[PDB]
Amino acid sequence: TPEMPVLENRAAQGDITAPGGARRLTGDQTAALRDSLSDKPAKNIILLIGDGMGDSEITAARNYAEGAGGFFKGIDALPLTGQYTHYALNKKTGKPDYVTDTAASATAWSTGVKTYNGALGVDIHEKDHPTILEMAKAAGLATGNVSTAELQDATPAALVAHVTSRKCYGPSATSEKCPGNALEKGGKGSITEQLLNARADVTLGGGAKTFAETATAGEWQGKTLREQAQARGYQLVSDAASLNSVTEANQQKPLLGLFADGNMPVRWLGPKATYHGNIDKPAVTCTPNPQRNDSVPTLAQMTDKAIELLSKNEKGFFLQVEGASIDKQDHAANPCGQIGETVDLDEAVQRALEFAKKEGNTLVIVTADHAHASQIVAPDTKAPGLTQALNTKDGAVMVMSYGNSEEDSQEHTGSQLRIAAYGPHAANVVGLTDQTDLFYTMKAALGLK
Amino acid sequence: TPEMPVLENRAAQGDITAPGGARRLTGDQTAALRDSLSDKPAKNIILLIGDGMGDSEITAARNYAEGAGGFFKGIDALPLTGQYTHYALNKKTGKPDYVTDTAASATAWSTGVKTYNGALGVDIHEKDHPTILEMAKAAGLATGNVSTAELQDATPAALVAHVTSRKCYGPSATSEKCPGNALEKGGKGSITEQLLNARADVTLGGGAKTFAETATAGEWQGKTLREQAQARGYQLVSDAASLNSVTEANQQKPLLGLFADGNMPVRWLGPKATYHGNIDKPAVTCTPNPQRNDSVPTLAQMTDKAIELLSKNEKGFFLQVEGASIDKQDHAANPCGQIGETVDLDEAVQRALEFAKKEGNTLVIVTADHAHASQIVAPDTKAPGLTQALNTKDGAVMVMSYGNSEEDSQEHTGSQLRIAAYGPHAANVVGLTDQTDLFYTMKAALGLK
Ligand SMILES: [Mg+2]
Ligand SMILES: [Mg+2]
Ligand SMILES: [Zn+2]
Ligand SMILES: [Zn+2]
Ligand SMILES: [Zn+2]
Ligand SMILES: [Zn+2]
């Protein structure tokens, strides 16, 4: 039952051109904040990650989708907020590496240890460290791992795989890139093979392609990783209808959803940003991607389904949800694809907050693994990188810039970024914290050994 | 034992290469945050603005001067944090202009009304609106306006001047660019003339250059603004010694510190970023500015003296302190200058918080007017803009990039950014808020009118 308030509205209250019209607040917040502070146990935890969703990304998406004075009913609704650092480590010196990749940062909040770019579930000495999901399982809690990316991708993989390189998707890549993790060499196996061992109750995302590979050793040698999953009691789903049909998910009948060969389709389509794209060409208006359709579950749908199936566990559950393509489209200098995935994440957050407020003992956290490239710049900007003009909900033009790479892919940035929470122990994301603190916050909130 | 705590130490607690070594937290923060919430009246308010100090700028400065796992005993010590928006307005359409200049954003928190870029103390209809400082004085409180920039610059000018274009420093510029404001045309006059009229208790900064002009009309026609100042009872100083000599600052003896012809000198010097600078040039170690001097008050000293002189007003006081050159050096693509001015601001913040913790009824706020260009990128980055490698306190290299402008000056970015506070009503900066909300938060905290 509700007691801890979720922000109902932080949109501009009135006429932004008039006095007080742009205010997002309507009164003193001292009482609301006191009502948002509780150190009682968190029975469940829902961690939503917007890959590469730094403050710049959130703002850009709000400006376009909700207007500058708009409000994300999900993402902007968490009452307790802070900024956290996500630097990685140089593998050889052990010193800080100011700009992390996704594997090292995900490893940080999932295990509580800093590591080098490319590492998954291991530290700079390549020592494995239990993940919050594995720990949740060990304590008897149900577990969920959701993502719009291929499941072998760094973010969701970090919770169930321990490999020296995030490139080790299946047996093939592992034998070549992670010889020490290769199953035929006595290791724990590829990311996909370990994911199958982790056996989370609910796992949803893309990445069906790798399951086509066959094991090089072990009990299921010669069989495809898909056959192995089937043989190990997994219930495989491939689309919205089949997913909807699922009535239960547990260790006896673990759910594995493979909704795309690789990454799942993005929500919006738009051209890539170009050189002086905001000076020469006209303004862009994003448009829905036909490849999305109803046969493909949305992030909000996968979130709702996971909560349903996971909440059946009376002891509690841990669930991670990732809006993976915000980062990917940021890399491809594509504003529409980028913003569309942020809107996507916001819906997933709303579903989490909606459940969390009713349940009353659920901690919800929303943040990103690292900052990214996109910047909001003046309309008449003449930049050296890639830019694009966009027609926002405000009926005005917003220009986005990607200027940190001459190479084909735009890159991550080291700036600290927003982390927000709601529920029991949400106080621990306020002020300045580190990405590794999040692991300890989740561990403590659930009261894990 | 001051009820409300100031974050003592949120640096990495140990060996960052070890599990938990990078944690900034040592325990649950629920109790600490509760102790930080109070709705009692704020007797005093100290507003510190890092011009252009976005989260990226804060992160870069911390990385270089304190190390990635370091901690700004000032900037990072405020316990209540949020993210706010600072979009401006298109003067003709009234629609949002996603990237604001300094004038419009300062007007936003100074008057509570959004406006067009370049405007100072007026809305899009060119109508004046009271500033938090003008209101504080009228309420019988002591008023202080401190900056490391020429006092006619947008940030400190927004608290005492109402003109259509921030370029209207003195009579000359005003008659040409702000005719409707030009004194000899019935207007209230230029920025400097209006500043003299505002007559704040303490005004410290640079910009003596403009005081050489002579009024075109009014009671002090033909007389220089400096002369007018002296003739109107103003107590002027021009160096550290002369400033340290003042023992009182009031309406009959208003203090006016002019320590430089234009902007005050920066703390650190370094090479300007260049094309592929991080690749073609050696990593840089910032060098102290020989011109920094010792007869020139530091931001921290001006801040400290302002508090001494203003704290005598039993009613209370309002003080705004601006670390102005963070932005200016960010425009110049000079990491060392930018970082040094952030370190400078941090010292002033420490003084503010030290006083606030003992006074017990002081609201301290640290934020910025808008985001900027600088980004922290990977060491091997090959970007199209300007870059540079730096030797940080960690004994590691950090690369910074400025890639949003082929023109002479790097530009602002529209990303929402950090705002933090300590003391009575500090809860009002938590979560998502708008820059105009800051005006009402300060007004209500002091309980004006
Ligand atoms: Mg990812
Ligand atoms: Mg300024
Ligand atoms: Zn990422
Ligand atoms: Zn990425
Ligand atoms: Zn500025
Ligand atoms: Zn500027």
CA distance B121 to B111: 7
- Resolution as reported, in Å: 2.0
CB < 8 Å to B110, chain A: none
Ligand 4 centroid–CA A369 distance in Å is 9
| Cβ pairs bridging A and B (under 8 Å) | 345
Closest to B420 measured CA to CA, from B80, B105, B93: B80
SS3 B429: helix
| Lookup: tokens for A165 | 């390189």
Q: Could you give phi then psi for residue B202, rounded to 5 degrees?
A: -130, 120
Compute and round to an integer the Cα radius of gyration of chain B.
Answer: 21
* Whole-Å CA distances, B8 to A115, B26, B230: 27, 11, 45
Q: Which of B294, B330, B316, B348 is nearest to B146 (CA)?
A: B348
For residues B77 and B348, the answer to whether their CB atoms sit within 8 Å is no
| Residues A193/A225, Cβ–Cβ less than 8 Å | yes
The first and second tokens of residue A69, run together, are 């004075």
Secondary-structure percent of chain B, ordered helix, strand, coil, rounded to 5: 30, 20, 50
Find all residues with CB under 8 Å of B170, minimum gap 6, and list them: B152, B190, B191, B192, B193, B210, B213, B225
Between the alpha carbon of residue A311 and those of residues A6, A361, B225, the distances in Å are: 21, 12, 72
Sign of CA dihedral B18, B23, B24, B27: negative
The two structure tokens encoding residue B60:
């870069």
**Structurally, what CATH architecture does the domain formed by B1-449 represent?**
3-Layer(aba) Sandwich (3.40)
Name the experimental technique: X-ray
Contacting B residues, span 322-381, partner chain A, CB-CB under 8 Å: 371, 373, 375-379, 381
A385 chain-B contacts, CB cut-off 8 A: 383-385, 403-404
**DSSP reduced 3-state for B350:** helix
Opening angle at CA B252, ends B248 and B253, nearest 5 = 40
Do B123 and B132 form a contact (C-beta atoms < 8 A)? no
**Could you say which of B80, B379, B431 has the minimum Cβ distance to residue A7?**
B431
User: Angle CA(A431)–CA(A435)–CA(A441) in degrees, nearest 5?
Assistant: 75
CA atoms of B4 and A96, how far apart (whole Å): 33
Distance (Å, whole) CA B284 – CA A211: 48
Residue appearing with tokens 């590691």:
B396
Quick check: A262 contacting B, CB < 8 Å? no
What is each CA distance from A63 to A325, A413, B272, in whole angstroms?
19, 21, 33
Q: Is A41's Cβ below 8 Å from some Cβ in B?
A: no
Domain boundaries, chain B: 1-449
Q: How far apart are CA B158 and CA B120, in angstroms?
A: 5
Q: Assess contact for A309 and A132: CB atoms under 8 A.
A: no
Secondary structure of B284-336 as H, E, C letters: ECCEECCCCCCCCCCHHHHHHHHHHHHCCCCCCEEEEEEECHHHHHHHCCCHH
Distance CA A158, CA A181 (A): 15
